[PDB]
Amino acid sequence: MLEVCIIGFGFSAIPLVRELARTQTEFQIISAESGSVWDRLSESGRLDFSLVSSFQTSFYSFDLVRDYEKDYYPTAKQFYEMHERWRSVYEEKIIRDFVTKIENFKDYSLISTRSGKTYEAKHVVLATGFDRLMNTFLSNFDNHVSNKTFVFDTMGDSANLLIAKLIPNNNKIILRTNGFTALDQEVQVLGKPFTLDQLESPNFRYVSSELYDRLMMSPVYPRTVNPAVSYNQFPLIRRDFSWVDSKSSPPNGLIAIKYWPIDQYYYHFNDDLENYISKGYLLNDIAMWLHTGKVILVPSDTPINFDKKTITYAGIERSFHQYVKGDAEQPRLPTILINGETPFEYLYRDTFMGVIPQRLNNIYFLGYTRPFTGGLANITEMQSLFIHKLITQPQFHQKIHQNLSKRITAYNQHYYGAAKPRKHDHTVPFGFYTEDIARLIGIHYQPNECRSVRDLLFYYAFPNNAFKYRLKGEYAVDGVDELIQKVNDKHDHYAQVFVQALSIRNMNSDEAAEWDHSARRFSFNDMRHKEGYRAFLDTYLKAYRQVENISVDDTVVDEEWNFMVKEACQVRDKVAPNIEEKTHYSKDEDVNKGIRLILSILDSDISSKFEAQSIEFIRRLLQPKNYELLFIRES
Ligand SMILES: Cc1cc2nc3c(=O)[nH]c(=O)nc-3n(C[C@H](O)[C@H](O)[C@H](O)COP(=O)(O)OP(=O)(O)OC[C@H]3O[C@@H](n4cnc5c(N)ncnc54)[C@H](O)[C@@H]3O)c2cc1C
Ligand SMILES: [Cl-]
């Protein structure tokens, strides 16, 4: 009987197939001839965009050890070409067919296919991805439409991409909204560029959940009164977060849009704009669009007449060309029968770590957990190690399964509390999830084993990417020592991130929120760095039109739109004048002082005013008081 059958081969399955091949475990892959969304986008010439996630978090460790030389955002073409390279390596292991049904029994499953052939396997892994309505819409979009109005009832990374393609042709965008969370995908730290995933230092949650909450949440929840942040200039961007009940922040179930702020876009791309646009680097700065009025936010109950295609706002009956509403993704699962009889109903909270459904036996799910920030690779690489160990080590399979229902209950109590289930439950902070899996497998690090300040920087501030856990032990990858060294040298050993936590250790949440927004450029949604890029935006629109071979008449003044913008931006016009120029920027000065201190004691042993108080905090990091995670235990 077949030891392992993997159903679906795209991107998520690659690291699991690698480990099964290494241990020479018997496996077979079954994957559809139709392919993936990337295949159909490639065939229609629509891989003309870029990822919302950094290279280090979006490609697997065994590629990074060869190819990493700098932080950057890959293109969609680069991502798909990597899928195809690995498909070519493993194609001899792939049967091209479509699984229609799985009958699950006590220790094996019977797999049915559209061709009529059946397969038996002890262990079955599903890696089939999601269906998304927005995908078809992206695949049929005519990007030459010009001088029209669009109404959106949803906002998300796919809607933000469509908006980026519409803005250059003088199209006007109305968002009927109940709020959204958007975050600059690259920020400045003392002028230097960092991708947002580098700033999260997740293991500081072990110091205390309250400290970590202060470190992370002021850009998401409306905690600062600073008139420069977008959620004070445009209050309709604020979401209702009354559902949150967990003390673990950012909460499981929070989602965010990641976008290019125009200042960092200028820094990277101004010298070769037409080529960068043609490669897929599109300016998608939703904060710049709100600043300029090219997008307006209106209340969710603003009335729409769908027969006449009008929306009524500011006393104006505004005609619109197209209405856009996204849909809920759903996992692409075949029929699955419990004990060969009872249809299985998929529920994220009823699985362990999104991988092990407790209602089935020896069936595992790979690729159905989504990261809050960064790429899917971090998640699926760790899931693959977890699945590989469950399949190949019976003692580990038993250790996890013997108390599986108790582990799931404990996980849900920790991360969701009494909150009712939500459709976005499957989204997790990536550096909590990777560390959780590492502790379950046993490839984690121990804070008490740090000897020097440099060791503490690696433990707490070096990002919890999957490759962090593949230097030593069971799942070691050749070349990770050099990769970690290069990343450390290019980021000053993450001292600047380490010092953030040091700086807010004694603040309450209001003080920490004010401190976060006291920088000359704070990380997220800083509306002081938009007006100065108006001339560049004109240059960008011209470049975009040249690449798409479009001529756009922008001579006609749309006074009606200008009136609607004025109504929509009343709060901005009252709040923005309160922005004050400052002589000193507390956060910039505090971080600069902290970096100098840390780099000066980098190689000091831990056992050997501000400096004294900082050294005391550092010594306490060897014995963090909030390390317990009850769902890791075997009891
Ligand atoms: C527009 C878009 C942009 C994205 N951008 C990013 C980004 O910037 N960063 C990031 O990290 N992720 C991004 N993703 C998410 C993610 O990386 C992709 O969704 C990725 O394709 C998921 O890989 P997968 O292997 O899980 O699924 P897929 O790539 O969809 O592969 C699954 C395969 O299984 C096959 N299959 C399905 N059902 C069956 C069956 N019953 N029998 C046999 N075969 C079957 C399918 O035909 C397919 O070939 C994006 C996704 C989309 C749609
Ligand atoms: Cl990177």
Side-chain angles (χ1 to χ4, degrees), residues 141-148 150 164-171 274 277 321 538-554:
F141 178 64
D142 177 8
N143 82 323
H144 283 26
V145 61
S146 307
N147 287 305
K148 305 291 191 293
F150 291 71
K165 291 165 165 282
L166 291 169
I167 288 285
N169 300 345
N170 202 38
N171 298 298
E274 289 180 3
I277 293 167
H321 180 72
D538 287 337
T539 297
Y540 171 84
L541 300 179
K542 284 179 161 280
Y544 185 101
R545 296 166 192 169
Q546 283 286 104
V547 170
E548 294 305 315
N549 292 297
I550 189 177
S551 53
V552 174
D553 180 7
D554 45 8

mmCIF file of all heavy atoms in Angstrom, residues 141-148 150 164-171 274 277 321 538-554:
data_model
loop_
_atom_site.group_PDB
_atom_site.id
_atom_site.type_symbol
_atom_site.label_atom_id
_atom_site.label_comp_id
_atom_site.label_asym_id
_atom_site.label_seq_id
_atom_site.Cartn_x
_atom_site.Cartn_y
_atom_site.Cartn_z
ATOM 1 N N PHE A 141 -9.865 41.598 -16.824
ATOM 2 C CA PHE A 141 -9.920 43.049 -16.721
ATOM 3 C C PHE A 141 -9.357 43.718 -17.976
ATOM 4 O O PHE A 141 -8.287 43.342 -18.466
ATOM 5 C CB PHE A 141 -9.143 43.484 -15.483
ATOM 6 C CG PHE A 141 -9.082 44.963 -15.299
ATOM 7 C CD1 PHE A 141 -10.236 45.682 -15.072
ATOM 8 C CD2 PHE A 141 -7.864 45.635 -15.334
ATOM 9 C CE1 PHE A 141 -10.188 47.053 -14.897
ATOM 10 C CE2 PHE A 141 -7.809 47.004 -15.155
ATOM 11 C CZ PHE A 141 -8.973 47.712 -14.933
ATOM 12 N N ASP A 142 -10.077 44.717 -18.501
ATOM 13 C CA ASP A 142 -9.583 45.546 -19.605
ATOM 14 C C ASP A 142 -8.919 46.781 -19.012
ATOM 15 O O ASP A 142 -9.600 47.682 -18.509
ATOM 16 C CB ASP A 142 -10.706 45.935 -20.560
ATOM 17 C CG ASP A 142 -10.232 46.854 -21.693
ATOM 18 O OD1 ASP A 142 -9.000 47.060 -21.826
ATOM 19 O OD2 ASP A 142 -11.093 47.357 -22.450
ATOM 20 N N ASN A 143 -7.598 46.839 -19.074
ATOM 21 C CA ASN A 143 -6.864 47.897 -18.397
ATOM 22 C C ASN A 143 -6.723 49.165 -19.233
ATOM 23 O O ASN A 143 -5.933 50.042 -18.864
ATOM 24 C CB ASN A 143 -5.481 47.388 -17.982
ATOM 25 C CG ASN A 143 -4.478 47.430 -19.111
ATOM 26 O OD1 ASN A 143 -4.808 47.170 -20.263
ATOM 27 N ND2 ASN A 143 -3.241 47.775 -18.784
ATOM 28 N N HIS A 144 -7.457 49.285 -20.346
ATOM 29 C CA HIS A 144 -7.490 50.526 -21.115
ATOM 30 C C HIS A 144 -8.701 51.405 -20.771
ATOM 31 O O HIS A 144 -8.824 52.509 -21.314
ATOM 32 C CB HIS A 144 -7.473 50.237 -22.629
ATOM 33 C CG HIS A 144 -6.119 49.862 -23.167
ATOM 34 N ND1 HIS A 144 -5.144 49.282 -22.386
ATOM 35 C CD2 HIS A 144 -5.597 49.950 -24.414
ATOM 36 C CE1 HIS A 144 -4.070 49.052 -23.122
ATOM 37 N NE2 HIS A 144 -4.320 49.442 -24.357
ATOM 38 N N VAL A 145 -9.592 50.968 -19.876
ATOM 39 C CA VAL A 145 -10.759 51.793 -19.567
ATOM 40 C C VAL A 145 -10.287 53.123 -18.989
ATOM 41 O O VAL A 145 -9.347 53.156 -18.187
ATOM 42 C CB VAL A 145 -11.696 51.042 -18.605
ATOM 43 C CG1 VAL A 145 -10.988 50.720 -17.296
ATOM 44 C CG2 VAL A 145 -12.949 51.854 -18.355
ATOM 45 N N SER A 146 -10.930 54.232 -19.403
ATOM 46 C CA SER A 146 -10.478 55.579 -19.059
ATOM 47 C C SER A 146 -11.638 56.530 -18.760
ATOM 48 O O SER A 146 -12.720 56.426 -19.341
ATOM 49 C CB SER A 146 -9.649 56.190 -20.201
ATOM 50 O OG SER A 146 -8.590 55.326 -20.578
ATOM 51 N N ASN A 147 -11.382 57.481 -17.851
ATOM 52 C CA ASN A 147 -12.301 58.594 -17.571
ATOM 53 C C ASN A 147 -13.681 58.123 -17.107
ATOM 54 O O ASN A 147 -14.703 58.717 -17.465
ATOM 55 C CB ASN A 147 -12.438 59.507 -18.794
ATOM 56 C CG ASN A 147 -11.201 60.348 -19.039
ATOM 57 O OD1 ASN A 147 -10.735 61.072 -18.153
ATOM 58 N ND2 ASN A 147 -10.658 60.247 -20.228
ATOM 59 N N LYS A 148 -13.709 57.079 -16.289
ATOM 60 C CA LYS A 148 -14.928 56.490 -15.738
ATOM 61 C C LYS A 148 -14.899 56.495 -14.207
ATOM 62 O O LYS A 148 -13.851 56.684 -13.585
ATOM 63 C CB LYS A 148 -15.103 55.046 -16.242
ATOM 64 C CG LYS A 148 -15.100 54.855 -17.755
ATOM 65 C CD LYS A 148 -16.327 55.442 -18.400
ATOM 66 C CE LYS A 148 -16.433 55.005 -19.867
ATOM 67 N NZ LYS A 148 -15.335 55.570 -20.712
ATOM 68 N N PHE A 150 -15.759 54.118 -10.743
ATOM 69 C CA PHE A 150 -15.925 52.759 -10.246
ATOM 70 C C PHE A 150 -16.366 52.792 -8.790
ATOM 71 O O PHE A 150 -15.903 53.627 -8.017
ATOM 72 C CB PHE A 150 -14.601 51.973 -10.364
ATOM 73 C CG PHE A 150 -14.216 51.677 -11.780
ATOM 74 C CD1 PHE A 150 -13.776 52.699 -12.619
ATOM 75 C CD2 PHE A 150 -14.301 50.397 -12.280
ATOM 76 C CE1 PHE A 150 -13.435 52.431 -13.940
ATOM 77 C CE2 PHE A 150 -13.957 50.133 -13.599
ATOM 78 C CZ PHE A 150 -13.537 51.154 -14.423
ATOM 79 N N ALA A 164 -4.833 50.307 -8.491
ATOM 80 C CA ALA A 164 -3.557 50.776 -9.039
ATOM 81 C C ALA A 164 -3.580 50.806 -10.565
ATOM 82 O O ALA A 164 -2.946 51.673 -11.179
ATOM 83 C CB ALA A 164 -2.400 49.888 -8.565
ATOM 84 N N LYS A 165 -4.294 49.875 -11.196
ATOM 85 C CA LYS A 165 -4.378 49.871 -12.659
ATOM 86 C C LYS A 165 -5.384 50.890 -13.200
ATOM 87 O O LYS A 165 -5.248 51.334 -14.363
ATOM 88 C CB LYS A 165 -4.732 48.469 -13.145
ATOM 89 C CG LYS A 165 -3.632 47.440 -12.941
ATOM 90 C CD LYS A 165 -4.197 46.049 -13.094
ATOM 91 C CE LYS A 165 -3.095 45.022 -13.260
ATOM 92 N NZ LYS A 165 -2.541 45.030 -14.648
ATOM 93 N N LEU A 166 -6.371 51.288 -12.394
ATOM 94 C CA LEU A 166 -7.399 52.233 -12.830
ATOM 95 C C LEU A 166 -6.961 53.694 -12.685
ATOM 96 O O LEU A 166 -7.270 54.534 -13.542
ATOM 97 C CB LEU A 166 -8.676 52.001 -12.018
ATOM 98 C CG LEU A 166 -9.424 50.704 -12.289
ATOM 99 C CD1 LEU A 166 -10.523 50.504 -11.196
ATOM 100 C CD2 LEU A 166 -10.024 50.713 -13.684
ATOM 101 N N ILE A 167 -6.261 54.020 -11.608
ATOM 102 C CA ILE A 167 -5.874 55.402 -11.291
ATOM 103 C C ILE A 167 -5.171 56.096 -12.458
ATOM 104 O O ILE A 167 -5.452 57.279 -12.735
ATOM 105 C CB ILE A 167 -4.981 55.408 -10.027
ATOM 106 C CG1 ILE A 167 -5.796 55.090 -8.762
ATOM 107 C CG2 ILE A 167 -4.185 56.720 -9.887
ATOM 108 C CD1 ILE A 167 -6.661 56.205 -8.269
ATOM 109 N N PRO A 168 -4.240 55.445 -13.172
ATOM 110 C CA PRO A 168 -3.488 56.177 -14.211
ATOM 111 C C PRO A 168 -4.316 56.657 -15.392
ATOM 112 O O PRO A 168 -3.859 57.565 -16.100
ATOM 113 C CB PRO A 168 -2.421 55.164 -14.661
ATOM 114 C CG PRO A 168 -2.233 54.275 -13.431
ATOM 115 C CD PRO A 168 -3.632 54.136 -12.879
ATOM 116 N N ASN A 169 -5.493 56.084 -15.646
ATOM 117 C CA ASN A 169 -6.301 56.451 -16.799
ATOM 118 C C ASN A 169 -7.413 57.434 -16.436
ATOM 119 O O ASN A 169 -8.438 57.500 -17.128
ATOM 120 C CB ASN A 169 -6.874 55.190 -17.446
ATOM 121 C CG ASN A 169 -5.790 54.222 -17.920
ATOM 122 O OD1 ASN A 169 -4.606 54.576 -18.023
ATOM 123 N ND2 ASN A 169 -6.192 52.987 -18.197
ATOM 124 N N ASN A 170 -7.230 58.186 -15.348
ATOM 125 C CA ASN A 170 -8.152 59.241 -14.915
ATOM 126 C C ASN A 170 -9.498 58.690 -14.452
ATOM 127 O O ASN A 170 -10.500 59.404 -14.459
ATOM 128 C CB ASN A 170 -8.379 60.278 -16.027
ATOM 129 C CG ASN A 170 -8.872 61.619 -15.491
ATOM 130 O OD1 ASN A 170 -8.440 62.072 -14.431
ATOM 131 N ND2 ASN A 170 -9.773 62.266 -16.235
ATOM 132 N N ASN A 171 -9.524 57.451 -13.983
ATOM 133 C CA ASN A 171 -10.734 56.882 -13.401
ATOM 134 C C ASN A 171 -10.877 57.289 -11.938
ATOM 135 O O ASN A 171 -9.891 57.364 -11.206
ATOM 136 C CB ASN A 171 -10.688 55.364 -13.506
ATOM 137 C CG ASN A 171 -10.653 54.890 -14.943
ATOM 138 O OD1 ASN A 171 -11.590 55.135 -15.702
ATOM 139 N ND2 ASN A 171 -9.580 54.196 -15.321
ATOM 140 N N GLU A 274 9.589 53.358 -16.564
ATOM 141 C CA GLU A 274 8.860 52.552 -17.545
ATOM 142 C C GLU A 274 9.278 51.079 -17.484
ATOM 143 O O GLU A 274 8.443 50.180 -17.638
ATOM 144 C CB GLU A 274 9.082 53.111 -18.959
ATOM 145 C CG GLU A 274 8.378 54.432 -19.189
ATOM 146 C CD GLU A 274 8.597 55.011 -20.596
ATOM 147 O OE1 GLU A 274 9.260 54.359 -21.437
ATOM 148 O OE2 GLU A 274 8.106 56.136 -20.847
ATOM 149 N N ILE A 277 7.794 49.555 -14.154
ATOM 150 C CA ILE A 277 6.366 49.300 -14.336
ATOM 151 C C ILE A 277 6.152 48.069 -15.217
ATOM 152 O O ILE A 277 5.322 47.211 -14.908
ATOM 153 C CB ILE A 277 5.661 50.547 -14.913
ATOM 154 C CG1 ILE A 277 5.662 51.685 -13.896
ATOM 155 C CG2 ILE A 277 4.226 50.214 -15.348
ATOM 156 C CD1 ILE A 277 5.279 53.044 -14.514
ATOM 157 N N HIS A 321 -19.584 53.432 -13.980
ATOM 158 C CA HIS A 321 -19.336 52.498 -15.068
ATOM 159 C C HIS A 321 -19.359 51.046 -14.607
ATOM 160 O O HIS A 321 -19.902 50.183 -15.308
ATOM 161 C CB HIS A 321 -17.978 52.833 -15.700
ATOM 162 C CG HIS A 321 -17.595 51.941 -16.833
ATOM 163 N ND1 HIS A 321 -18.208 52.001 -18.069
ATOM 164 C CD2 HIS A 321 -16.647 50.980 -16.926
ATOM 165 C CE1 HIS A 321 -17.656 51.108 -18.869
ATOM 166 N NE2 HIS A 321 -16.706 50.477 -18.201
ATOM 167 N N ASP A 538 2.628 62.789 -11.281
ATOM 168 C CA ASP A 538 2.361 63.154 -12.678
ATOM 169 C C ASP A 538 3.335 62.449 -13.616
ATOM 170 O O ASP A 538 2.933 61.921 -14.659
ATOM 171 C CB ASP A 538 2.447 64.666 -12.875
ATOM 172 C CG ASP A 538 1.262 65.414 -12.268
ATOM 173 O OD1 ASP A 538 0.188 64.797 -12.085
ATOM 174 O OD2 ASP A 538 1.400 66.634 -12.005
ATOM 175 N N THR A 539 4.619 62.407 -13.248
ATOM 176 C CA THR A 539 5.601 61.685 -14.052
ATOM 177 C C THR A 539 5.282 60.200 -14.120
ATOM 178 O O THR A 539 5.461 59.561 -15.169
ATOM 179 C CB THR A 539 6.993 61.904 -13.459
ATOM 180 O OG1 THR A 539 7.310 63.298 -13.543
ATOM 181 C CG2 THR A 539 8.036 61.099 -14.194
ATOM 182 N N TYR A 540 4.813 59.630 -13.006
ATOM 183 C CA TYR A 540 4.482 58.215 -12.970
ATOM 184 C C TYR A 540 3.292 57.901 -13.880
ATOM 185 O O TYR A 540 3.321 56.914 -14.629
ATOM 186 C CB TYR A 540 4.205 57.776 -11.520
ATOM 187 C CG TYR A 540 3.646 56.372 -11.426
ATOM 188 C CD1 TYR A 540 4.489 55.259 -11.418
ATOM 189 C CD2 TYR A 540 2.273 56.143 -11.386
ATOM 190 C CE1 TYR A 540 3.984 53.982 -11.376
ATOM 191 C CE2 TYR A 540 1.762 54.857 -11.350
ATOM 192 C CZ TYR A 540 2.615 53.778 -11.337
ATOM 193 O OH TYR A 540 2.114 52.485 -11.298
ATOM 194 N N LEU A 541 2.249 58.736 -13.843
ATOM 195 C CA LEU A 541 1.081 58.499 -14.684
ATOM 196 C C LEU A 541 1.454 58.527 -16.156
ATOM 197 O O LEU A 541 0.988 57.685 -16.931
ATOM 198 C CB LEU A 541 -0.017 59.526 -14.386
ATOM 199 C CG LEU A 541 -0.551 59.544 -12.943
ATOM 200 C CD1 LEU A 541 -1.613 60.645 -12.820
ATOM 201 C CD2 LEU A 541 -1.108 58.220 -12.491
ATOM 202 N N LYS A 542 2.322 59.470 -16.556
ATOM 203 C CA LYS A 542 2.782 59.511 -17.942
ATOM 204 C C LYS A 542 3.530 58.236 -18.321
ATOM 205 O O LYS A 542 3.334 57.689 -19.419
ATOM 206 C CB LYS A 542 3.690 60.719 -18.164
ATOM 207 C CG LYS A 542 2.978 62.037 -18.263
ATOM 208 C CD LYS A 542 3.991 63.152 -18.452
ATOM 209 C CE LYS A 542 3.346 64.405 -19.017
ATOM 210 N NZ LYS A 542 3.149 64.294 -20.498
ATOM 211 N N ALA A 543 4.411 57.766 -17.435
ATOM 212 C CA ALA A 543 5.180 56.551 -17.695
ATOM 213 C C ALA A 543 4.278 55.330 -17.813
ATOM 214 O O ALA A 543 4.449 54.503 -18.723
ATOM 215 C CB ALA A 543 6.198 56.350 -16.574
ATOM 216 N N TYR A 544 3.307 55.206 -16.901
ATOM 217 C CA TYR A 544 2.379 54.087 -16.936
ATOM 218 C C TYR A 544 1.618 54.056 -18.261
ATOM 219 O O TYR A 544 1.465 52.995 -18.879
ATOM 220 C CB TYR A 544 1.407 54.189 -15.743
ATOM 221 C CG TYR A 544 0.500 53.010 -15.629
ATOM 222 C CD1 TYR A 544 0.763 52.004 -14.713
ATOM 223 C CD2 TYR A 544 -0.634 52.892 -16.434
ATOM 224 C CE1 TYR A 544 -0.055 50.915 -14.608
ATOM 225 C CE2 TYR A 544 -1.464 51.795 -16.333
ATOM 226 C CZ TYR A 544 -1.165 50.810 -15.407
ATOM 227 O OH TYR A 544 -1.966 49.705 -15.288
ATOM 228 N N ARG A 545 1.119 55.212 -18.710
ATOM 229 C CA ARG A 545 0.366 55.232 -19.965
ATOM 230 C C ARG A 545 1.246 54.839 -21.143
ATOM 231 O O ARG A 545 0.795 54.142 -22.057
ATOM 232 C CB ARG A 545 -0.269 56.606 -20.192
ATOM 233 C CG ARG A 545 -1.316 56.979 -19.122
ATOM 234 C CD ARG A 545 -1.664 58.462 -19.199
ATOM 235 N NE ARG A 545 -2.429 58.894 -18.035
ATOM 236 C CZ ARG A 545 -2.680 60.161 -17.733
ATOM 237 N NH1 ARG A 545 -2.220 61.153 -18.480
ATOM 238 N NH2 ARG A 545 -3.416 60.440 -16.658
ATOM 239 N N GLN A 546 2.514 55.260 -21.140
ATOM 240 C CA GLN A 546 3.401 54.866 -22.230
ATOM 241 C C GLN A 546 3.589 53.354 -22.270
ATOM 242 O O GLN A 546 3.587 52.750 -23.351
ATOM 243 C CB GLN A 546 4.749 55.567 -22.089
ATOM 244 C CG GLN A 546 4.731 57.025 -22.508
ATOM 245 C CD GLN A 546 4.657 57.204 -24.005
ATOM 246 O OE1 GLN A 546 3.605 57.535 -24.557
ATOM 247 N NE2 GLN A 546 5.783 57.004 -24.673
ATOM 248 N N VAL A 547 3.749 52.724 -21.107
ATOM 249 C CA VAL A 547 3.946 51.276 -21.067
ATOM 250 C C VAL A 547 2.720 50.547 -21.596
ATOM 251 O O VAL A 547 2.845 49.549 -22.315
ATOM 252 C CB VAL A 547 4.294 50.812 -19.643
ATOM 253 C CG1 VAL A 547 4.261 49.269 -19.545
ATOM 254 C CG2 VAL A 547 5.655 51.328 -19.254
ATOM 255 N N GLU A 548 1.521 51.022 -21.246
ATOM 256 C CA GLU A 548 0.292 50.364 -21.684
ATOM 257 C C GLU A 548 -0.200 50.813 -23.060
ATOM 258 O O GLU A 548 -1.248 50.329 -23.510
ATOM 259 C CB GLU A 548 -0.806 50.585 -20.645
ATOM 260 C CG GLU A 548 -0.517 49.904 -19.292
ATOM 261 C CD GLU A 548 -0.248 48.399 -19.417
ATOM 262 O OE1 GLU A 548 -1.001 47.710 -20.141
ATOM 263 O OE2 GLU A 548 0.725 47.906 -18.800
ATOM 264 N N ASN A 549 0.539 51.682 -23.751
ATOM 265 C CA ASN A 549 0.176 52.178 -25.084
ATOM 266 C C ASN A 549 -1.221 52.787 -25.109
ATOM 267 O O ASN A 549 -2.038 52.513 -25.992
ATOM 268 C CB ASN A 549 0.291 51.068 -26.127
ATOM 269 C CG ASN A 549 1.711 50.653 -26.355
ATOM 270 O OD1 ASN A 549 2.537 51.445 -26.807
ATOM 271 N ND2 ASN A 549 2.016 49.400 -26.042
ATOM 272 N N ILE A 550 -1.490 53.658 -24.151
ATOM 273 C CA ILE A 550 -2.793 54.294 -24.068
ATOM 274 C C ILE A 550 -2.619 55.805 -24.123
ATOM 275 O O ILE A 550 -1.645 56.355 -23.603
ATOM 276 C CB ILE A 550 -3.543 53.848 -22.799
ATOM 277 C CG1 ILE A 550 -4.984 54.349 -22.826
ATOM 278 C CG2 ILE A 550 -2.859 54.345 -21.562
ATOM 279 C CD1 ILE A 550 -5.799 53.873 -21.647
ATOM 280 N N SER A 551 -3.554 56.470 -24.786
ATOM 281 C CA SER A 551 -3.667 57.919 -24.738
ATOM 282 C C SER A 551 -4.880 58.275 -23.892
ATOM 283 O O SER A 551 -5.975 57.753 -24.125
ATOM 284 C CB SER A 551 -3.820 58.496 -26.143
ATOM 285 O OG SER A 551 -4.889 57.852 -26.805
ATOM 286 N N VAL A 552 -4.700 59.190 -22.948
ATOM 287 C CA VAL A 552 -5.767 59.571 -22.034
ATOM 288 C C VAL A 552 -5.940 61.079 -22.088
ATOM 289 O O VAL A 552 -4.980 61.826 -21.865
ATOM 290 C CB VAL A 552 -5.475 59.119 -20.590
ATOM 291 C CG1 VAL A 552 -6.536 59.650 -19.644
ATOM 292 C CG2 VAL A 552 -5.404 57.597 -20.505
ATOM 293 N N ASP A 553 -7.169 61.518 -22.353
ATOM 294 C CA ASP A 553 -7.526 62.933 -22.332
ATOM 295 C C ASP A 553 -7.766 63.346 -20.884
ATOM 296 O O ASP A 553 -8.735 62.904 -20.255
ATOM 297 C CB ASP A 553 -8.771 63.179 -23.182
ATOM 298 C CG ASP A 553 -9.188 64.642 -23.208
ATOM 299 O OD1 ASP A 553 -8.432 65.489 -22.683
ATOM 300 O OD2 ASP A 553 -10.282 64.942 -23.742
ATOM 301 N N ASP A 554 -6.891 64.201 -20.356
ATOM 302 C CA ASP A 554 -7.004 64.699 -18.990
ATOM 303 C C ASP A 554 -7.154 66.217 -18.977
ATOM 304 O O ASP A 554 -6.687 66.897 -18.059
ATOM 305 C CB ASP A 554 -5.798 64.255 -18.161
ATOM 306 C CG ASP A 554 -4.484 64.440 -18.900
ATOM 307 O OD1 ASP A 554 -4.500 65.049 -19.992
ATOM 308 O OD2 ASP A 554 -3.440 63.966 -18.401
#
